[PDB]
UniProtKB/TrEMBL annotation, chain B:
It comes from the Bacteria. This is Microviridin. The chain holds residues 37 to 49 of 49 of the full protein. The gene is mdnA. It comes from Microcystis aeruginosa MRC.
Length: 223, 13
């Protein structure tokens, strides 16, 4: 997250870190046994780290649980990034508490101008690299579809939306992929892609979770 | 170069 702020420990209790011997992506806990992340975050062996603040120190609110299943959307396309969603089933259920909690799925899509919270452990610089130990947060609005398409001609599908600031300076970044975009207490987005980070006229692009709610529920029920 | 995985998407190819 570029241009964000330190969230505070365990203030985003649905945020997870996906770990393959190092943090590589975020995710969102949607029930005690299931996480939503990006399809491009798939790997064969993932450890989900719940309850994290400082990802480099054992502080005592963590739960480390291996993924048993990581289920990429069958229509995910790695060239266009359409359908960039994955479901992760935990090998055992997380213990839900004030520091480890689920986020609700949406009942409707969000409108332009809705303010959302975006979070992660990704890069905090728009040029070069600086990776945080503690979780970062950004408040950012959803943009109009027309503004989003104008920023990324030919690239925005109906399964994507843009959020952020066209002036630059505030955005998600590498290491934030898969993490949450929460608006009015609902998971509306998944960190997906952008051109650079926090650049002028190049907002973040997020998977539109409201298009997948039925798919998520059916995938969970059958797995 | 567009996806937001650490360290990058292309790095994993
Ligand atoms: Ca920790």
């Amino acid at each position: 997250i570029v241009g964000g702020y330190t969230c505070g420990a365990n203030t985003v209790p649905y945020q997870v870190s996906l770990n393959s011997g190092y943090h590589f992506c975020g995710g969102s806990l949607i029930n005690s046994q299931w996480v939503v992340s990006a399809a491009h975050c798939y790997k064969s062996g993932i450890q989900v780290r719940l309850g994290e603040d400082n990802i480099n120190v054992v502080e005592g609110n963590e739960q480390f649980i291996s993924a048993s299943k990581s289920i990429v959307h069958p229509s995910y396309n790695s060239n266009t990034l359409n359908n960039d969603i994955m479901l992760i089933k935990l090998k055992s259920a997380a213990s839900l508490n004030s520091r480890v909690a689920s986020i609700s799925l949406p009942t409707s899509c969000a409108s332009a101008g809705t303010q959302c919270l975006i979070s992660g452990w990704g890069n905090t610089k728009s040029s070069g690299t600086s990776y945080p130990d503690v979780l970062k947060c950004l408040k950012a609005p959803i943009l109009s579809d027309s503004s989003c398409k104008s920023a990324y001609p030919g690239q925005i599908t109906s399964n994507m939306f843009c959020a952020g600031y066209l002036e630059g300076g505030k955005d998600s970044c590498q290491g934030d992929s898969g993490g949450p975009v929460v608006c009015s207490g609902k998971l509306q987005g998944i960190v997906s892609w952008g051109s650079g980070c926090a650049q002028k006229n190049k907002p973040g692009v997020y998977t539109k979770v409201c298009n997948y709610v039925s798919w998520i529920k059916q995938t969970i029920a059958s797995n | 170069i567009s996806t937001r995985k650490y360290p990058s998407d292309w790095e994993e190819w």
